[PDB]
Amino acid sequence: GSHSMRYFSTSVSRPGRGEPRFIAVGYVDDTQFVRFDSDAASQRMEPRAPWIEQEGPEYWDEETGKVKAHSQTDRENLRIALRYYNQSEAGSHTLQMMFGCDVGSDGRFLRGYHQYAYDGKDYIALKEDLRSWTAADMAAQITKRKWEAAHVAEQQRAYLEGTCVDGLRRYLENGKETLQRTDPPKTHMTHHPISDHEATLRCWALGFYPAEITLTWQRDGEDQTQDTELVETRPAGDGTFQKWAAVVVPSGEEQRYTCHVQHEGLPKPLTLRWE
Amino acid sequence: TYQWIIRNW
Amino acid sequence: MIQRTPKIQVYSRHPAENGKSNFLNCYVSGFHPSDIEVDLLKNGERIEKVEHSDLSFSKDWSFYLLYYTEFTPTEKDEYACRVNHVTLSQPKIVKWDRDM
Ligand SMILES: [Ca+2]
Ligand code: NA
Ligand code: NA
Ligand code: NI
């Protein structure tokens, strides 16, 4: 239905030991498709999905250039932040950037993003309106007044609405066989003793895409909000994801418990039990 | 389709 | 400055099948800064050259990575991953369970 395109950049300054390291990744929903690394041998925007490999030679040139300009921009921004936060040149710092767009089932614009972060905390972020900025601190306000005076947001709006959505649209049609194809979870149950009065029931879910899954547990008919250990959705290695939900039940009361699996790959949400 | 990330802090 | 502890999950690509070749994964997430040391182990001995994912982050600026190697699971041989970060007092070794 609804889709997303996101670009994540990371700039890590190396005190004295050469140029800072720049890593940039491009994602369409939960699937990565492009890569850039300042340490990598090519010094080019590298494909990481087969549906992007088809793209033109000047596409790769334009994309390499844009990401190359960014690496330079954030290495300058790392120097600017040392002045702004009055910090030593001997300390290693992190500068992260996220930008992208959301599209509806129809394919039209939904939301746009453009935000920075210095040393793990937020720095500056473009508001939902795509007209004003949000400065997290006093140092970020210097950037706010600069970009508001220069009318930067107008050029940001111009990309997010348009250049971005047309890009996502093209990427979706060119890779509909993988990006739009939903894989349902390959569910299974398990039981461990742990003690003579208690027992653990794990509700597994494997090989699914997209990553959004909702595994819930139930004692009788009602949902067990607490007492349910949920691991975070982890990647398999291939385009699929894995997740599990566990519950500590009183020994012998295993019949009372049922697991509710929710995924868009399923035509109706599953309800399972231990046997 | 990468954006023109060129503005300084 | 801000520093975040890594959340480690050691598992397998496909469900446990003895004799048939699989992939061992050590997924580190929610950590800051990006400098992390992750090694996979065969009976407590570091596995030779383990490929990893491209550095990316979550909606909170915290990082995540996936370390992986083509391995053959068997009843004999133990598997664990050693994770070292600035936030850690000493390296954490998390052992692989058949039912993770
Ligand atoms: Ca590396
Ligand atoms: Na430099
Ligand atoms: Na503000
Ligand atoms: Ni495979």
Residue numbers in the entry:
A (entry chain A): 1 to 275
B (entry chain C): 1 to 9
C (entry chain B): 0 to 99
Which sentences from the paper describe this structure?
Instead, we identified a potential HLA-A24-restricted IAV/IBV cross-reactive candidate, the immunogenic IAV PB2549–557 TYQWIIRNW epitope. This epitope shares 55% amino acid identity with the cross-reactive IBV PB2550–558 variants. Indeed, virus-expansion with IAV/HKx31-infected C1R.A24 cells induced cognate IAV/PB2549–557+ (A/PB2549–557) CD8+ T-cell responses in 2/4 donors as well as cross-reactive responses to the IBV PB2550–558v1 (B/PB2550–558v1) variant and the B/PB2550–558v2 variant. We solved the structures of A/PB2549–557, the overlapping A/PB2549–559, and B/PB2550–558 peptides in complex with the HLA-A24 molecules at a resolution of 2.90, 2.95, and 2.16 Å, respectively with clear electron density for each peptide. Solvent exposed residues were at P4-Trp, P6-Ile, P7-Arg, and P8-Asn, representing a large surface accessible for TCR interaction. The P9-Trp of the peptide formed a network of interactions with HLA-A24 tyrosine residues at positions 116, 118, and 123 as well as the Leu95, likely assisting with stabilizing the complex reflected in the higher stability observed for the HLA-A24-A/PB2549–557 complex than with other peptides. Structural overlay of HLA-A24 presenting the A/PB2549–557 and B/PB2550–558 peptides showed that the antigen-binding cleft and both peptides adopted a similar conformation with an average root mean square deviation (r.m.s.d.) of 0.31 and 0.37 Å, respectively (for Cα atoms), consistent with T-cell cross-reactivity observed towards these two peptides. The A/PB2549–557 peptide is conserved between H3N2 and H1N1 IAVs61, and shares 55% amino acid identity with the cross-reactive IBV PB2550–558 variants. Structures of HLA-A24 with A/PB2549–557 and B/PB2550–558 showed that the antigen-binding cleft and both peptides adopted a similar conformation, providing a structural basis for T-cell cross-reactivity between these epitopes. However, only the A/PB2549–557 epitope showed immunogenicity in HLA-A24+ individuals, with the instability and bulged conformation of the longer A/PB2549–559 epitope potentially proving challenging for TCR recognition.
HLA-A*24:02 allele, highly prevalent in Indigenous populations, is associated with influenza-induced mortality, although the basis for this association is unclear. Here, we define CD8+ T-cell immune landscapes against IAV and IBV, restricted by the mortality-associated HLA-A24 allomorph. We identify immunodominant protective CD8+ T-cell epitopes, one towards IAV and six towards IBV, with A24/PB2550–558-specific CD8+ T cells being cross-reactive between IAV and IBV. Consistent with the HLA-A24 peptide-binding motif generated by NetMHC4.037,38 motif viewer, enrichment of Tyr/Phe at P2 and Phe/Leu/Ile at P9 were observed.
